Amino acid sequence: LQLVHSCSEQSPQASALYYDEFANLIQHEKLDPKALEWVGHTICNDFQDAFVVDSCVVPEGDFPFPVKALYGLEEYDTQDGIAINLLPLLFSQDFKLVSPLCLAPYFRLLRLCVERQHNGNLEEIDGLLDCPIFLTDLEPGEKLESMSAKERSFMCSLIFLTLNWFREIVNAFCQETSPEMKGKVLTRLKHIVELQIILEKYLAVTPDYVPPLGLLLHNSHAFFRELDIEVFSILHCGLVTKFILATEVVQLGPPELLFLLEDLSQKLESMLTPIGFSHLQQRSAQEIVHCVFQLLTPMCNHLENIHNYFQCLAAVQEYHIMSSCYQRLLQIFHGLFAWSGFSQPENQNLLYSALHVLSSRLKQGEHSQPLEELLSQSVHYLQNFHQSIPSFQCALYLIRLLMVILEKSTASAQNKEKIASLARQFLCRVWPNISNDQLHALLCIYLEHTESILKAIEEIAGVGVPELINSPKDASSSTFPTLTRHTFVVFFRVMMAEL
């Protein structure tokens, strides 16, 4: 083991691959106590000797940007001597055993190894968490119009490794069940979100330049390290509205909710609907659906709260941020209910346990009832949210959600009529832009589930297009308000295909 470690020490990519693969191996397999504690002791010694340093800052390499303490425990003081010097080492190597450019795998090994020895109870790793990182107060270059030079390229390179570190730290500390420390990991969310804003600003000013790592949508899954499903146990914590408004404790705001929920949606859509990911695939498809299933009650309570928020608003950037959060939340719910495993009879009781709670969400104290009735008030409960649907693309997801939870149903005709009625409600509604494929899917399901397809086609044609030629160019007000020039072609395509 130490032979292969020393041989692979020089190569950074091969080293990082060794660290990540060995960490996965330790995670998903059992090792003997002596070898496990030996490798844990050696890697802990190497990590302590390499990166951990005194709180006093010693600049090296004569870098031009002054460095101040940031991104640490709020009650931090100079007495706590722990600190990390990732940026001096990156500046030195950019401009041999130490390799902070692959810092994230190293900590993962530590995050496994002590957990094998101590069975949790990691005070030293909590000390590693509590320390800050000394870095310049980095901001976008527009304050001085920073040209994309070598120094700016290095600074933009630093953001990915900082985000990976602050992602793996919350990956590590999610499982800890102590109440006081919870806000600490929430502060890490509050860090990475602003860093993510900073990250996309560096994509805005320099879209062409891309730092390496072993447009932002493509780069996010590739660069950012994966996270365990247990990380989404942080979503068990309740949220609080920020724009409108556990005192003196951080709480789940909207954008960290969007971030975690979008990561969950990417993972769920990648798995359930057949690669960029390598950690989730090792876990099977049965325990993961159980893990997200036990989590559905908190995120459904979040759906309730944000729906009530939008109802209260019904009477700036946070509005569409929460709207996109709503979109992603409905996407999670549909994707969870769209698993192909529920078709086969293996996990029917799991599906039933998915929806009894929903029934308890609507009318408390009802259980062990027939499945068709329970899903009937479940679809009624989902239908109650149809008013608080700000973004248009959510609506079709909700309609699709209804269909899948109404796929496993008996009274097909009534369900189809209800789906058609709600689709008509969405279509006739005005909206404030919109991808044509969303119109394609929505009109497809609407015309499919209407009682008379041919009558509906002639009806939409006669009511709309005569009104369109009567109406002026841009305004396409009719029974169908969304019948503008950027929509007529998909309308014609959908009516022709359904005909």
Swiss-Prot record:
Implicated disorder: Fanconi anemia complementation group D2: A disorder affecting all bone marrow elements and resulting in anemia, leukopenia and thrombopenia. It is associated with cardiac, renal and limb malformations, dermal pigmentary changes, and a predisposition to the development of malignancies. At the cellular level it is associated with hypersensitivity to DNA-damaging agents, chromosomal instability (increased chromosome breakage) and defective DNA repair.
Portion of the full-length sequence here: 614 to 1242 of 1451
Record function comment: Required for maintenance of chromosomal stability. Promotes accurate and efficient pairing of homologs during meiosis. Involved in the repair of DNA double-strand breaks, both by homologous recombination and single-strand annealing. The FANCI-FANCD2 complex binds and scans double-stranded DNA (dsDNA) for DNA damage; this complex stalls at DNA junctions between double-stranded DNA and single-stranded DNA. May participate in S phase and G2 phase checkpoint activation upon DNA damage.
Annotated domain remarks: The C-terminal 24 residues of isoform 2 are required for its function.
Entry superkingdom: Eukaryota
Modified how: Deubiquitinated by USP1 as cells enter G2/M, or once DNA repair is completed. Monoubiquitination requires the joint intervention of the FANC core complex, including FANCA, FANCB, FANCC, FANCE, FANCF, FANCG, and FANCM, and proteins involved in cell cycle checkpoints and DNA repair, including RPA1, ATR, CHEK1 and BRCA1, and is mediated by FANCL/PHF9. Monoubiquitination prevents DNA release from the FANCI-FANCD2 complex.
Tissue: Highly expressed in germinal center cells of the spleen, tonsil, and reactive lymph nodes, and in the proliferating basal layer of squamous epithelium of tonsil, esophagus, oropharynx, larynx and cervix. Expressed in cytotrophoblastic cells of the placenta and exocrine cells of the pancreas (at protein level). Highly expressed in testis, where expression is restricted to maturing spermatocytes.
Protein name: Fanconi anemia group D2 protein
Disulfide links within the chain: none
Family listed: Belongs to the Fanconi anemia protein FANCD2 family.
Compartments where found: Nucleus
Summary of subunit composition and partner proteins: Homodimer; cannot be ubiquitinated and does not bind DNA. Part of a FANCI-FANCD2 heterodimeric complex that binds and scans dsDNA for DNA damage. Interacts directly with FANCE and FANCI. Interacts with USP1 and MEN1. The ubiquitinated form specifically interacts with BRCA1 and BLM. Both the nonubiquitinated and the monoubiquitinated forms interact with BRCA2; this interaction is mediated by phosphorylated FANCG and the complex also includes XCCR3. The ubiquitinated form specifically interacts with MTMR15/FAN1 (via UBZ-type zinc finger), leading to recruit MTMR15/FAN1 to sites of DNA damage.
